[PDB]
Amino acid sequence: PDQFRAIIESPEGAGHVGYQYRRNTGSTMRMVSDVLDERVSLWDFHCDPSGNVIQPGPNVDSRQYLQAAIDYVSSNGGGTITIPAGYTWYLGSYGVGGIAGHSGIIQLRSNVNLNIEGRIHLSPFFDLKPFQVFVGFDNGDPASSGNLENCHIYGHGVVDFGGYEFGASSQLRNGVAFGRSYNCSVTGITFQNGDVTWAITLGWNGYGSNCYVRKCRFINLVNSSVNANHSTVYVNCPYSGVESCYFSMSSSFARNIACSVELHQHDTFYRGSTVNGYCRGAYVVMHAAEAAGAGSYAYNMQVENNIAVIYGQFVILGSDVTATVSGHLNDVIVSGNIVSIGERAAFSAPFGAFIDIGPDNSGASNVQDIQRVLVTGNSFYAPANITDSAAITLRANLNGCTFIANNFDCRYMVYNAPGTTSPVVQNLVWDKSNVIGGTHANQRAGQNLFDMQFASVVNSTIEVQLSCEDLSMFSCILFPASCQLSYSKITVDSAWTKSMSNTAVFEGNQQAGANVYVSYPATVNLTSYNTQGAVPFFSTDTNYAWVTSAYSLSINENLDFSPPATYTNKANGQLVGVGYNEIGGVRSVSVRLMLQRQV
Amino acid sequence: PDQFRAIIESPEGAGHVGYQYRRNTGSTMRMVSDVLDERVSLWDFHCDPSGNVIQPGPNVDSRQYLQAAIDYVSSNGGGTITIPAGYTWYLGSYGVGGIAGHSGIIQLRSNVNLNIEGRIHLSPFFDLKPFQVFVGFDNGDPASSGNLENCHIYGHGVVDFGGYEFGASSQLRNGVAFGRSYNCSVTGITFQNGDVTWAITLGWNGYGSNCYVRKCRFINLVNSSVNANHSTVYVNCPYSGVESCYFSMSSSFARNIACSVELHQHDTFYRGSTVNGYCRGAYVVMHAAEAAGAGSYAYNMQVENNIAVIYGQFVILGSDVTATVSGHLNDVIVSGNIVSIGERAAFSAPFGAFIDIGPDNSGASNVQDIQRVLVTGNSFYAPANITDSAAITLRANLNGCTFIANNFDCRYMVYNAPGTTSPVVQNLVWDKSNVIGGTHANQRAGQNLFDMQFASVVNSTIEVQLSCEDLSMFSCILFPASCQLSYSKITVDSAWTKSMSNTAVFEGNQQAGANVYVSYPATVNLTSYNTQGAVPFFSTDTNYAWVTSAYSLSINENLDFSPPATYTNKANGQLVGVGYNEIGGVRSVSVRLMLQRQV
Amino acid sequence: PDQFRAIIESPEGAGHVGYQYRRNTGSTMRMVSDVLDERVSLWDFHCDPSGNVIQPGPNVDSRQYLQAAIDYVSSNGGGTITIPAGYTWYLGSYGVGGIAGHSGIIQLRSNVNLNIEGRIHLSPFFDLKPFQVFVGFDNGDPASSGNLENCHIYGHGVVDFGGYEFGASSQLRNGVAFGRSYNCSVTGITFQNGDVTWAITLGWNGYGSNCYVRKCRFINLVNSSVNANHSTVYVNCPYSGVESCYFSMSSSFARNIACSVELHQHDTFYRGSTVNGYCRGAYVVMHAAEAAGAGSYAYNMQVENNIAVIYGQFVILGSDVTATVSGHLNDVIVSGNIVSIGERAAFSAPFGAFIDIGPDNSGASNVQDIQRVLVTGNSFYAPANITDSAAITLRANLNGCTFIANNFDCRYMVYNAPGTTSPVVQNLVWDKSNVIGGTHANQRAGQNLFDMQFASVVNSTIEVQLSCEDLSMFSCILFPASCQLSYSKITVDSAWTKSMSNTAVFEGNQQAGANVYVSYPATVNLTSYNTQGAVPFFSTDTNYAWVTSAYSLSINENLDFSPPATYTNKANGQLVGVGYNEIGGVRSVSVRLMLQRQV
Ligand code: NA
Ligand code: NA
Ligand code: NA
Ligand code: NA
Ligand code: NA
Ligand code: NA
């Protein structure tokens, strides 16, 4: 009996108190400790060497306790550790072993989930230092790392990076690096208050699968000029993605350096998220340097139904090569996104774009293999002052991209800066169902709406359709003489173009090519013969040898004659058609025509 | 030892029984009470003054117990209170203090989540009375209220409003009012069986952020003629939304009064939901009266990938003004929705529409500032008998709206009732990729498919394309003489129009305007001169002074001559072209032409 | 006191140890057993007849214990049973009673949820036998079954089917059959390693509502040639769907037999999912045989924003009839999907398609009633070698289907095999905004891009637009003489067609029909009269009696004359136009024209 009181007060006491669920005679006859052992929290490991519980706080380093918890639960085949609500748990030292090569704090282990209901904060030990808060690699060399499987982090809690700036631009900082990660996820968590490189990374160079970030918040994760670059989630394994997240930055530096998501492997997605205050929406890129685990192709890439206010580019496409591997990007869909460039001065952040075809990280524009991309059903808006805003900035070689049924309301439709790169363009398709807005009407002095500053364009379609006037622009579409153009279709619808001096401009006369199909409006001066009755009219100028037919876009204010309704050409480059002189006389008129070639 | 038995049976007993997790020697030496204290339920507060547990039931008011639980957990920095499964917990009185001004039952508190696994019912004390079941305001005056932060309500449970009708139309009833709410959400819950104004409201006049309703059900929440108006979720803070919910009504009154969602602040969404039995899908509105917390602009508004059977309008757009604030709506996307008007008689519910540009709550149509809206990739269907069905009912001033690649199968495409409002319309864009269905073919006697009953139309595009015949309609598009039309493009594709007497009708001759670009089919009678050889044909009528060119849509059944293939005009308003008389003679023919002006 | 030690060690011991939450004097004075009774796990029933806990393992059949748990919790109004993490729980026998008719293992009960954190495996007792692991029917005859309501299965755990092959093709195997299921769901679970017919089925012949599968994984669920057919989720009740799931197969048999989802009742969806290794994406079908619970119409069907690599067809549409019921499919949207046919030889799996209009299960093609379908904003790709790849394989009667703003990059656009079925086609709409890719350029010898192998086509639109050349194809569009064509619009844009011998081909001369509206390019030889001045040119051939106008697509390399720019016809079927002879002489030219009829 002495001994009984002793047992009951001992740590084995609950193991002596019987329990049967709801007094049910068919239930297991258990002990209290058995039922308590079905759950586990940080409190079960957050104790001193004598087993006395330690209270968390700014002057307590919780790291070793949390690691002990993870280690122990891992040893039993897994489970879920709760990080209790109503407490802030500070981390105040680096981890040891395999994660030290990654500046790791906590090592994640397979099947061991974390339910973060309270707050995890970084203590000032980490000020000006690199860190990766949770790491799933088990080796300093990721190539020699084991996998992390079935690890979920979820809850209503918070990871707070303590506000600390980077100490040097070369440093790396991360929230969760799942590593070579298979069926891992983060759900519900708020990441906030730091200066970091990534909040979450999924996979490693294509090793991993089925990793997701869902219903998380990322708030104020860049705060300094030291921060070299920030991408909030970096998706580096296939069959993985980001859904229904919220991303916000307030720093000025974030407007120049921060991107919300990167998709770097096949069968990856970015959907249903809201972004504010970032430079960029998403990179969609196949790096040859990352091709080890899942091949050299990024395909089935999806960016859909997101909402964004950014300062630079919404989606950036890329692929590149190494000495022995070539990366390819194909089968991409960008749809349903509503995006705007936030209020800013022209040229005060990276050049505004809905899509950017960017050069590689060395600036090379002749290594890319990007094709079979569909951009459909998106809206884009930039305020009227933002000269540096385009539907697509096409700055590197492009093997195809298709635009259907978007609404683009910005300075340029297609742009690339002259005397920069000279991309080779194939299979650029701009369907007539793309609606060109009018916010930048009157701002386009000296500018071409479609500024085709490329080395060459083949197998491309540009069907221009205005929906309001903008007589300030120099042309709707212009090809410099250095841009070859072949096997293409280029049309300018006449609506809102009557008063334009230039509609389509071919500075090398490239619309003459055998397999170029074009149409655009032009003003033409004609003169007739004197004959009464059916009578020819001929253009005064001889620059129409390429024209297959033309037809009037002007009314005839005369009674005594009419010019031809339709024209063909002659070998000397004149247009010619048959009009009617009710009364004879040489006539001379200036008419707006629709010039057509092979259409 | 006497004393030990006593301690063990006392309420401090579990605090004397030791426990160490899984017998792990490195785990904390705790007491049973410590582990039990990691969770909390309603049972921990649902007790009489002596501490004896009280069973819930229809004759027990659970309100004070649940409030006590919330209050206590709030005092510890938060946590999650479970509302146990297998019990119905009745609420039978009003709350006190700050929530009394809101007819509040329970006051929510920051960081205190509710996991509702059982059922919460309203007792008949609430019959014919106002109530707001859960309220996050802490003051009767919302302007003087504190915030609610980090409050989540979730579970497999149920909030049941007891079936009670409203007592007076002026009363308000709500399920959850989060208040000035930051990172709050409702997930998984079924709201059912009532007559209420809202089930959930998020935010207050733009104060709040990151509030969401996800995977909830709302069933039968209007049941009486007294109910003035019902909107199931009212989103009144930015960076907030509704995703993957189910909404159903069976009441006849709901078909006239109920809307599923309202989006009232920037960066808000409504996605992936299913609606049946409601009048309306969503309001997307910037009320000046609600502009305090987040500015005067609603932008980045998203309605996507929903499924609906409604009786009135799917999306209703609006903005309005007060004495000192002006509200603006811009940058909206409506995409991927599949919607139909349910079976009903014509005019038996509010006028059926996919989009409605509605007047303000006072009926004013000259205060709105709505622009940069994209409606793309949606389907809409109304049964053939529903005369009052339109793709857009445009009833108030519109500063722009763009339709691309939709499928609209209803009575009207564009409509506004004559002798009602006379909206000023700018930047209405109806792309040719909008497919017009054929359900209402043969029903359109006396009606114009595009009925342009506006004060004026500028910078607009209407590209009509039929996909089957409907010879019952009076015209494809008609402009009354009171509607000014300028700087616009209006086209009628000829397919399925050969037999139409009227295609495009300009009752004020507005197609003559200098910057109007049109084309449409017409039948024209021509007569030739007698000359053998090339010979002019001239229209008998003189109403073509606006025509820039025309071309034949008819075959020539003659051998001895041919009419012109193409025509221009003359100053007297005749058309003229050059045909061919193999043999001489005056000819007289009636031809279907495509009339063109500046296109 | 003797007696006290005894009570404490007994199974009623925890019922004698007092507890009050956090020492709060206003909290309930409870006993430890009360707090433990708030949760329940399998361990509470996994015991021998004496109440001693049994360890799970390969040689322990856990079935009776899990059933006992479900039964008991059901008796208390429900709750959630945990299936503990860190253990595999084997099932090794069949259930008894109502579920025996369904080869059921476990019977689900209303309000009793399962939180599966560990693993559930099938023992080899099930090798070569039928089984349905969890069944919600309570009767062997589903027609006499009660309902299952409010049953959720969720967690990070796993259902493993043990790898066992089917014993006979006629056998059925399933993971979860919810039965006549109302507010039931599966969330988070991994189904893997089997040879089964379905993983999950929702509803029964239209009985059920609000059933969902969310964030689950289905991995390797076909493994044998015996397996007759596999569809991973079969949705057989309305207001139900599949969201954000992952489906993968590696078996060769799956490429021929497996589909990811079937939608079989109204108001159902399939969204945001990733599929690899399957034959098919989704069936969307109204079976008359399944019309009992929710009517004879499947409407509001949504397939959106999915990512797929399949070997056969992405979406298959269907409806059929029984002796007394007729099934109808209408109001369908397919949008935002990015799909490809995986690498395979031509004809090595079922014919590749984005959409298939399939015959019924008996092969009948004259029973379907499918209409009001919108296919918009999708991408589809098949590798160049896959002859058997189409945007739509149209193999049964079709009452309407609309394609807007897709990107299809495969061998055929519209296809049906000749001398197979002869479908009746109405309201097939192929908008010009559909972009036709170029992967299969040069592969189309002998083939028609749009191969119209139908009994008849009415009220249809085909607007062909190429975006690169493919001179290998026999035609862009061909109608055999056996296909009637009326009240339709068929156009071939001229871009990339100059060198094509055949563009549109009407083998029965059907383009002559009164209400056929067409345009396409053709080469025509003309001869003029000798007259100096305005002079007629006439076609040598007489096959143009149907032509309403034509215009030049060729330049004029002559100085001394010009052919007409535009032409009409004459009764003998010649074309005729007026050109100009600067000098006299009979001229003879070959010109590319755009032939037009009523457009
Ligand atoms: Na490192
Ligand atoms: Na493409
Ligand atoms: Na060049
Ligand atoms: Na009030
Ligand atoms: Na717009
Ligand atoms: Na007016």
Ligand code: NA
């Ligand atoms: Na059976």
Ligand code: NA
């Ligand atoms: Na349709």
Ligand code: NA
């Ligand atoms: Na036939």
